[PDB]
Design a protein around this ligand. Structure first.
Ligand SMILES: O=C1CN2C[C@H](N1)c1ccccc1S2(=O)=O
Length: 281
């Protein structure tokens, strides 16, 4: 059981050691499309690339490339798109992907500015009456409503395909209180946030995969997907303590490199799964 394994690693202070074994066992697949010179202004970080095998392709004949991966968790029957925070020149591509993959939700785990630098473009409207038009991808985005709570904001957005005049409702789940350094002290507000996303239907198989991002799309984003999938597997399995976080994380790392960036994020993931298991047992 992971709770005892938690106490063992914590009492022995072995988190950096566990984390290094995960780093050493992690998959390494080609990312040739990411590294083409024509794609250098589509990547926020030169050392964070989708693998070719799991990369989301835009349906635009010119350049299909976006820094985004499909993470397919076969046993849990859950998919996620993990992506980087959009850049100024990729906001249109972002919303094109949302449209094309039939996503119902967008999960944002960063603030636009952290540590005095921009981590993400402002890619949604701040006021109802000032909609955004992405001329490159022929999409219109309108803010419908915004519910601001202590730890997170939920926004209803209308995405319109200007080409077909079809419209869809997108839910934007913005976790606003992840600290600039380290991880939250308690996983309570993060679990509350994850349960809210689940309750919305955004993670349900009726819809395309949820889009999840932070700045790079691997750290905080990783923690979100890892906790969700681990909790879902505990519901599904005859024996809930058969769930090994380290194995699930390595399975997720076949689809996108670097998921969970620090030993602190790994400890936090264990704590979130352990605490969330109480509200699921
Ligand atoms: O802050 C930026 C702005 N861009 C995204 C990324 N960094 C980058 C990296 C290498 C070359 C060009 C660019 S960018 O498109 O100007």
């Amino acid at each position: 059981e992971m709770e005892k394994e938690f106490e063992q690693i914590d009492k022995s202070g072995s988190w950096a050691a566990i984390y290094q074994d995960i780093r050493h066992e992690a998959s390494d697949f080609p990312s040739r499309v990411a590294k083409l010179p024509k794609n250098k202004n589509r990547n926020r970080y030169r050392d964070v690339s989708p693998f070719d095998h799991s990369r989301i392709k835009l349906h635009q004949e010119d350049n299909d490339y976006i820094n985004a991966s499909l993470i397919k968790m076969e046993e849990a029957q859950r998919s996620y798109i993990l992506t980087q925070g959009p850049l100024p020149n990729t906001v249109g591509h972002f919303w094109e992907m949302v449209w094309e993959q039939k996503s119902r939700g967008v999960v944002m785990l960063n603030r636009v500015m952290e540590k005095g630098s921009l981590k993400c473009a402002q890619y949604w409207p701040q006021k109802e009456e000032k909609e955004m038009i992405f001329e490159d991808t022929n999409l219109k985005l309108t803010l419908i409503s915004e519910d601001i709570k202590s730890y997170y904001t939920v926004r209803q957005l209308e995405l319109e395909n200007l080409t077909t005049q079809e419209t869809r409702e997108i839910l934007h789940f913005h976790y606003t209180t992840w600290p600039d350094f380290g991880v939250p002290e308690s996983p309570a507000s993060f679990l509350n946030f994850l349960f809210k996303v689940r309750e919305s239907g955004s993670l349900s198989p009726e819809h395309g995969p949820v889009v999840v991002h932070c700045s790079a799309g691997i750290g905080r984003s990783g923690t979100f997907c890892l906790a969700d999938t681990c909790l879902l597997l505990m519901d599904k399995r005859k024996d809930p303590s058969s769930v090994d976080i380290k194995k699930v994380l390595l399975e997720m790392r076949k689809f996108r490199m670097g998921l969970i960036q620090t030993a602190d994020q790994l400890r936090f993931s264990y704590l979130a799964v352990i605490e969330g298991a109480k509200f699921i047992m």
